[PDB]
Amino acid sequence: SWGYREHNGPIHWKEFFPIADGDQQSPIEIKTKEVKYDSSLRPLSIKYDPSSAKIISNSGHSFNVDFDDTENKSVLRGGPLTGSYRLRQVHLHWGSADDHGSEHIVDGVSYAAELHVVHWNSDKYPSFVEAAHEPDGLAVLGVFLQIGEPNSQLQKITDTLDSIKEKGKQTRFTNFDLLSLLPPSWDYWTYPGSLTVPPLLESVTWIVLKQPINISSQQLAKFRSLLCTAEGEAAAFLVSNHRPPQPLKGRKVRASFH
Ligand SMILES: NS(=O)(=O)c1c(F)c(F)c(S(=O)(=O)CCO)c(NC2CCCCCCC2)c1F
Structure with missing residues (x-):
């Protein structure tokens, strides 16, 4: 089964x-020299309710915070999107060392980690599972993390990691302030792409924020002690969980900002 080890990692997913x-x-x-500002993008609208957060779990591939998404309390609108995309889950990607770990790379710059906020088109589709199979089904916000001063807004997450050390573990996780994990500027790039994990479906409108947030080295290291293995199984550590960039193959990236 797929992962990020030698004989199950990204080069083998094909x-x-x-x-x-x-x-x-x-x-x-993202090669900024080639990106065009597009004045037709609408303001990005982010309405998030902390009570929408329900559980955090270790999927084996990252931690996932899952949200109650039968309600429009937490939704992403505007930007490049038509309609209301309901918040579903949040997870994070990192590498085995602090100097690289992000999934998107900007003018050859890698960040230490990248948070993804996954939303789905509930104005058109019946469920997140369904929406993952349509071109306009998903919208994913990416936020880079750069090494810097520790980030107090990651404490609710980091405090839970020992409880979810093994794959399949879950813990109650509500009253989560997601909005405060976002950087102060919301300027972004956007392009049509895919999930970055199997099944790799081409159903995502990516919205990647230009401004990074900080994380300290010590905080980032705590994510690498999560296991990709379940209880009662020989331990392996989730020290890296990022897919490398794939070619544009003709797509163009748009910018929200000039
Ligand atoms: N990196 S990603 O944004 O493209 C993404 C999704 F968009 C996404 F929807 C998911 S999913 O997990 O919600 C199932 C999609 O059908 C994951 N997840 C992966 C990495 C994080 C751990 C939990 C999901 C299992 C793989 C995921 F990584």
Whole structure:
């Protein structure tokens, strides 16, 4: 089964998921010189309710915070999107060392980690699972993390990691302030792409924020002690969980800002 180890990692995913070499795969390199500002993008609207957060779990591939999404309390609108995309989950990608770990790379710059906020088109589709199979089904906000002063807004997450050390563990997680994990500017890049994990479906409108947030080295290290293995199984550590950028293959990246 797929992961980020030598014999199950990204270079092998095409073996079971040949859309891995598709034309709209993510993540990507953003070459700013080539990006065009687009004045037709609407203001980005983020309404998030802390009570929408329900559980945090270790999926084996990251931690996932899952939200109650039968309600429009927490939704992403505006920007490049038509309609209301309901918040579903939040997770994080990192590498085995602090100098690289983000999935998107900007003018050859990698950050230490990248948070993803996954939303789905509940104005058109019946469920997140369904919406993952349509082109306009998903919208994912990416936020880079750079090494800097520790980030107090990550404490609710970091405090839970020992409780979810093994794959499959879950813990009650509500009253989560997601909005405060976002940087003060929301200027972004946007392009059509895919999930960055199997099944790699090409159903995502990416919205990648330019401004990073901080994380300290000590805080980032706590994520690498999560296991990709379940209880009662020989331990392996989730020290890296980022897919490398894939080629643009003709797509253009748009900017929210000039
Ligand atoms: N990196 S990603 O944003 O493209 C993404 C999704 F968009 C996404 F929807 C998911 S999913 O997990 O919610 C199932 C999609 O059908 C994951 N998840 C992966 C990494 C984080 C751990 C939990 C999900 C299992 C793989 C995921 F990584």
